[PDB]
């Protein structure tokens, strides 16, 4: 809600709070999402200030506190800021922002990532460009240059990041990504490259420097009906582990299909429904094998802006003999949400 | 190394008295890298010679070691 | 170009008829109607220069300014000291790509009392930044499998910002495969107020090239070479109404690979040189009477890589040069002058400086006489590489020059003759097996230019001749021609744009490269023709068309190496 | 911003965004700052309320959450909250607060810290009164009760705390502080003293019980300039680490100059320069040793109130050869704020 708007500058807090559990056969371990209560409460603020006609400024930063944590040493576990940068929107030539922003991939793979409470599995977090990474500086243009409408494009540099893990570490990277929305059509490709750091190549799976996404999709969203997909492809960029060996890295190569359908009713209804999968190339002692293989059949009853439930069950098609000690089960959630 | 630096000198030996030519860059080039390598060669010479050293006295090391444990036994 | 605005002559803006050294300038307009792909095609039609290269684009291709070493012109990137010279100590054109240029100003005559060490030829200051907004979609397909594509915008953020992008691609044949360049550069320029302005800037590009290298089995080919170079520049600029303040900083790195594809860019058989420059530059100028007194520092550092330039190590030169300037035109009189002092971390300090008088005896035609004397500093390789020597001294140029320049009857013509005395030549003595500071040389030469309009015709015709001799052999510096003829006509009919650039390059006298020892040979002088014709299909779509030496002359400018002939040029732009 | 001014109450919630990046030569151990990604972002809240014409309440907190981490094990790392505290201001005798709020000596050692990102190094955290520590009963009087304007002092007493760490752990403490302001120029001067704790003298650095910490600051501000120069001197005070040994403990003798120039335009344009050296002597088999010897250059472009941009270039000149492993590198910083 926009809570400040003086001065010629506009502050809009945001935040919401979801009770929410998992279900699934067993004590969850196997399960494709998990099983239990996974109430978590978001919280973030959005700033503008148009400092001339032609020139803003703003602002964004969120953070997500979950709720299932006890009280205990563990009440942090799973408490983050997933968002927070700031950036100049110019009137016409276009924005230039820096911070902790989505990837441009992002982008491209924001059509499938419309379910209630999974989708976007493909789109990991501190992962290259594909999810909201920090150390990011993005310029955007809308309709290039107001010349044609429609197609904006974006481009991000991606500063090195040495962390500890290779899982949330990176290196200089670059980006690019298209989209052409017309009439209601929507059309874009996004592609980004990256060097992968001592401590990736230093991992027992996962071989080369070149970590390589990209992606294209594709939607049509009209008449309460949102239809979409992306194909995405990437090399070394994709995080992987092994149960069985207990050991990670990353994935030589990776080939992910998105679809998605969901249609939406004037009484606040919205059933869903979503293909996945993602199968996994070059694998070092597994060669191929797929990392996940499932349907979606969901919902969400919309009270109002502010009030929603819904319901998403995962049909797991992937096999218990999977080779990488991967959840083989179904998995199902039901949220409730209130949000300002 | 030193052959191919040697080969290297007498491939622009040509220029030695040609001061005017591109060759004759690369010659006193090929010139440094023969002394060099010339030196290198004379310290993996004297490293080598050493290491004979050791490992001869190893050799007769063991010869004196292994009586003594006939002996002892 | 007659009464316009330059900034080579004392760093500032000037009209360069105020300019009392012969001077031109060739705009982005000009070059696109010369359709040129090449800056040393641009420079090959200037007077007094005199352009060799092995064959094609990219070719290994040395420039003589009225006669003189390759080493003895100051080549400037918006004004400072090219760095792809740096290594060598010399200038060599045809690898830096044409697209970057937008302006020359090309001043022959002594600079050193204004730009330092290794201004002898004169001072060509190629200013990549101009003024016309929008932005030009553009391609061209030539002979020699050339090919070229280049995006440009530059715009306004508000009143006092400008960015400006390109973007280019280009490739040539023309050696089996010729040179690839990939060129891309950013700029923005603010004005913080009427006055006080700033800039930041960086481009880079990689040039990929390929040559014919001295085989021999079992050792490697190094017949590739691949530069990856970028350029940072950052300034602030005071234009006041009486003062003007120029702070100027630059950081260029350069990386130089020379390999046998087969072995590899970066196997132990390739050769590395790596080398970074920085620059910083103070200028300060005041209008005193009917002139001005400017005063700066420049100051430079360079650095190298093991290895680079033929060296073992790399170095660390620095050097910097406090120079002054001043300028006073009093009644129908003009003079200016400027001394300086390079202090170089090589071999300490050494002065220079010239000055030039300029007497209007009939409105419209004066008498210009000017003296100067220019250093030139030994390089990397006579200074450091085993033939090498540290204590060397600079190589000293004293010039002198005298012109008469008038406008008669809607013609403007200079007759100018110059005397270039260079001394203590850096030589290399084959009994000694060292670099000694022996050489001397004699230029002696005439400019004769003429510009004038006829109704549509625009001629501008000038004929050169120079006698570069060895001050101490008396035998003339071989590779040179005795004389050249340099004739445009430019015509525009029906919106046809019209251009026929004309030139004869005399004798040159070259080695012969077959037999040894290598003898000397004559060169024939022969002439070379071009037709460039340019149409605009839309007030956007403009296509144009070039035949370049179109007679398919059998010219050569190093003995043995072929040069390409006849050679065509297609191309269209989309300007909006 | 003001969110809830009703009913004699008022809050208002300030909060702001940094997208800020570090560089250096080399990975940055040896850098004066560090090296990478700073981005942070802070939030807190102030509220006043007159309860009595007289007497008014008010209470003021501060966090800040740093962006730089991931999402991983450390994405807690570096969180923390800066202020909270409370406290009353009487009409004219003054006011007096208690909480987590910066020692008297800070008062003194605020003219230099005026910096963008780096300044106020002498001014550590937890440290005994120069930098924000828990635990703090502070006596304000303003312009001595009213009787003589622009003289101002201030009483601070810190309750003793026991910490895991020598540093982050303190002693019963006492201190003072007094500012006179007039006609822009201004002078300060402020005093500590506090009893070190066992873990603290059992530290291999450092000798003596009374921790002992005091500065002297002056000043002139106007017309779009600001000048500083505080000199500080303190026993068994200061933190010290040696990376050669490990091994770190307090300083038994130390003196800090720090010299400050800022000058700022009309078109939101703000250069500084600034000046910083701290000599530590009767170090522990190290004699006198130079900590920190820096000048700093750098700007600042104030778009507005709620928007800017900075830079700041750190020429460190300690030498490689400190005893203390110390950084012996330049360093380089770039920023950008959003803030309400």
Redesign the interface.
Known sequence: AE??N?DG?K?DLYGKAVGLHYFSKGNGENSYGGNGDMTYARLG?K?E?Q??S??T?????E?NFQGNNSEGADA?TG????L???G?K?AD?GSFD???NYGVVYDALGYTDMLPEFGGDTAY??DFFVGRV??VATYRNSNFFGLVDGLNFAVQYL???????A??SNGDGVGGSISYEYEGFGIVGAYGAADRTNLQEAQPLGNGKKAEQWATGLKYDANNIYLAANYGETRNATPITNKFTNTSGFANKTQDVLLVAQYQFDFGLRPSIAYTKSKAKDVEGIGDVDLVNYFEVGATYYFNKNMSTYVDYIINQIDSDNKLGVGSDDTVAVGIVYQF | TLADAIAEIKQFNRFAHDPMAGGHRMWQMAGLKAQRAQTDVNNKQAAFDAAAKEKSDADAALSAAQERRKQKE | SPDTLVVTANRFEQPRSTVLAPTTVVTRQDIDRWQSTSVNDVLRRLPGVDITQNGGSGQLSSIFIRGTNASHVLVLIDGVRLNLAGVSGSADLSQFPIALVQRVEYIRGPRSAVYGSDAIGGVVNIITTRDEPGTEISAGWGSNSYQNYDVSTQQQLGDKTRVTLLGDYAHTHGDNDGFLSKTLYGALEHNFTDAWSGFVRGYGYDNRTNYDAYYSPGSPLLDTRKLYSQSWDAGLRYNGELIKSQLITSYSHSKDYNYDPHYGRYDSSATLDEMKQYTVQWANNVIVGHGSIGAGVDWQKQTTTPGTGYVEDGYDQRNTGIYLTGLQQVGDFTFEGAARSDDNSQFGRHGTWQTSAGWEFIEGYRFIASYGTSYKAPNLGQLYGFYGNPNLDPEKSKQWEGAFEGLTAGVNWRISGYRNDVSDLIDYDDHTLKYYNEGKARIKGVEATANFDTGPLTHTVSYDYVDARNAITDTPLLRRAKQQVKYQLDWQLYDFDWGITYQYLGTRYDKDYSSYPYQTVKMGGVSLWDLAVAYPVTSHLTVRGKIANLFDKDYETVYGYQTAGREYTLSGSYTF
């Open positions: 809570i400040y003086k500058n502050v603020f700033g200030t400092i001339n032609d020139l400024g703003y602002g964004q930063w953070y942090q408490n983050k800021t997933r927070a940068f700031a100049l110019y030539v820096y911070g902790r977090s501190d920090g150390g500063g090195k990041n040495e962390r500890d893990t899982r949330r």
